[PDB]
Amino acid sequence: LDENRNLVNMQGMQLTGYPATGTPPTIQQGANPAPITIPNTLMAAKSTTTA
Amino acid sequence: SMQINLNSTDPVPSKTPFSVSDADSYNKKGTVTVYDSQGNAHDMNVYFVKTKDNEWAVYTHDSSDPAATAPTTASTTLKFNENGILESGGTVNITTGTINGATAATFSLSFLNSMQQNTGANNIVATNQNGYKPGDLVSYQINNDGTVVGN
Amino acid sequence: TKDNEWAVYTHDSSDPAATAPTTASTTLKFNENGILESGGTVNITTGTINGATAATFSLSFLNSMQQNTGANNIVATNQNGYKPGDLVSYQINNDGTVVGN
Amino acid sequence: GATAATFSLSFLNSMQQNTGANNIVATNQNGYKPGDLVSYQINNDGTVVGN
């Protein structure tokens, strides 16, 4: 992980792949390849809708 | 040109009608990058929803323009024959948004060579487009036929 | 200042008493293709340093082009004025022309 | 006798939710302190930077 916590090689080579989009984010194979980002930001809460 | 393989056994989404926000409202999503006169990149998101057997509605929307209208009407409708040959609706004119003064990109998007069978999953075979961004000389070469080619 | 509209200011950093530019020197306007349409040439006058005349020259932005390049890069700069110098070398070219460098 | 320092303090990105306790996610500031040169280096992009 680099300064922005992205997946990098020795040289700083940024890893890329299919990102997660939507609410909640989902894996989209048809989406354009984007760099994989792993932020340390805390997760908010989602109100329960179905139980 | 956008060539895809469509699965016949995908169930029709229960969350009708089509909604961009609703991920489960569409069977497949693809993205093709086009370019305007000023070279701005527009990520045409296309959505495939099966309506009935051998009938697939395809919707289009650009994520680059926040002022673009939400797609509520069929961009095109692919009709397919018995053995997976295309029948009609494989070509449609598509206009992008207006970003930073760039004129909207009006291009003919074609679903030719698309074939629909019992694929195990939803996959897009090929995406091609003849637009690009401005480029600058990074190398030059001479081929065996004598063609001078600048990369 | 907005899409396809670029205000352009000129300032003289060499003059210790140079006035801060407060009015637009020119306005570059761009067509749909990012080409120049107006404002590509403007007459700019420099300051007066060491008692010499200010240089009144036509600055031309010819072939300036605004498109989705990754950043703002200056392609070419040129000016036809030169400083005084002494003779360094000389040569006779293949066409008989005698050139002093 | 220093001149008064007035700064814009912002609690942006702060949130009130059902976290286990009052926890500070991050602090950031633009002010700094004097100190002598220790190291100098030239990065892969040609930048000359002193630390």
Side-chain angles (χ1 to χ4, degrees):
Chain A
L1 320 157
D2 91 334
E3 193 171 355
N4 284 58
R5 303 298 181 169
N6 327 299
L7 281 183
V8 281
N9 267 342
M10 291 335 89
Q11 304 80 35
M13 274 337 313
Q14 297 161 294
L15 207 41
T16 166
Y18 296 126
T21 62
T23 306
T26 54
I27 293 301
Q28 291 290 77
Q29 295 202 338
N32 289 174
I36 317 201
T37 57
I38 307 186
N40 60 347
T41 316
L42 171 148
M43 211 206 288
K46 177 180 172 202
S47 190
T48 303
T49 281
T50 303
Chain B
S1 308
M2 152 75 88
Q3 185 183 0
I4 63 184
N5 289 346
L6 288 164
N7 174 36
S8 71
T9 65
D10 313 319
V12 174
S14 60
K15 208 158 194 176
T16 56
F18 161 68
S19 167
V20 279
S21 316
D22 292 358
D24 50 358
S25 78
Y26 51 81
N27 291 86
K28 182 56 182 198
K29 175 186 171 171
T31 302
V32 48
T33 309
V34 317
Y35 305 98
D36 306 359
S37 67
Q38 314 283 6
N40 313 67
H42 291 251
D43 311 61
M44 291 324 317
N45 293 190
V46 310
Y47 315 68
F48 311 84
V49 185
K50 189 181 173 186
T51 59
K52 277 165 289 312
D53 294 334
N54 309 330
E55 296 197 345
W56 305 77
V58 179
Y59 295 137
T60 55
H61 172 67
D62 59 346
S63 62
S64 298
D65 183 16
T69 54
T72 56
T73 307
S75 306
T76 191
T77 301
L78 307 177
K79 298 196 174 212
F80 250 92
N81 310 64
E82 291 96 50
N83 296 323
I85 313 299
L86 185 64
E87 184 182 52
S88 65
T91 290
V92 61
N93 294 326
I94 281 181
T95 325
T96 69
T98 298
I99 284 294
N100 292 122
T103 177
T106 298
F107 65 95
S108 171
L109 171 149
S110 179
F111 270 89
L112 218 50
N113 303 323
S114 299
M115 165 152 184
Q116 160 207 307
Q117 294 307 349
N118 187 231
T119 56
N122 291 333
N123 182 60
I124 289 158
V125 152
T127 61
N128 321 143
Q129 64 93 37
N130 70 331
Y132 37 86
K133 325 164 72 152
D136 313 302
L137 279 192
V138 305
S139 68
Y140 44 101
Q141 64 186 62
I142 303 173
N143 300 332
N144 65 61
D145 310 287
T147 65
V148 189
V149 176
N151 176 211
Chain C
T1 206
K2 66 151 200 290
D3 301 334
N4 314 330
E5 281 315 91
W6 294 77
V8 177
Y9 294 92
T10 81
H11 174 61
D12 189 317
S13 164
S14 298
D15 180 18
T19 56
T22 316
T23 58
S25 266
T26 189
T27 49
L28 303 181
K29 303 200 177 212
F30 284 136
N31 320 69
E32 189 47 53
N33 295 325
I35 316 315
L36 279 193
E37 61 156 320
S38 64
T41 56
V42 58
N43 266 32
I44 300 330
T45 301
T46 48
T48 295
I49 308 314
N50 294 120
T53 71
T56 75
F57 53 80
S58 171
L59 164 40
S60 182
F61 279 89
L62 189 67
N63 264 307
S64 307
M65 206 203 97
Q66 178 214 285
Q67 191 158 329
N68 194 337
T69 290
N72 296 330
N73 312 36
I74 301 157
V75 153
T77 55
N78 170 282
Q79 59 90 32
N80 76 329
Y82 48 65
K83 24 186 182 67
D86 249 342
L87 184 58
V88 152
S89 63
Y90 67 53
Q91 63 189 62
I92 300 172
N93 289 324
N94 304 347
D95 43 358
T97 323
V98 187
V99 174
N101 303 3
Chain D
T3 206
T6 299
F7 65 97
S8 171
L9 182 58
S10 182
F11 297 102
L12 186 67
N13 304 321
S14 304
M15 85 199 64
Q16 183 233 1
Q17 214 161 104
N18 197 234
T19 54
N22 293 335
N23 185 59
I24 292 162
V25 175
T27 61
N28 205 335
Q29 59 94 37
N30 74 332
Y32 266 122
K33 34 163 161 173
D36 53 38
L37 183 58
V38 202
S39 64
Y40 36 58
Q41 61 182 59
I42 303 172
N43 302 306
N44 64 62
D45 38 35
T47 55
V48 188
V49 277
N51 316 337

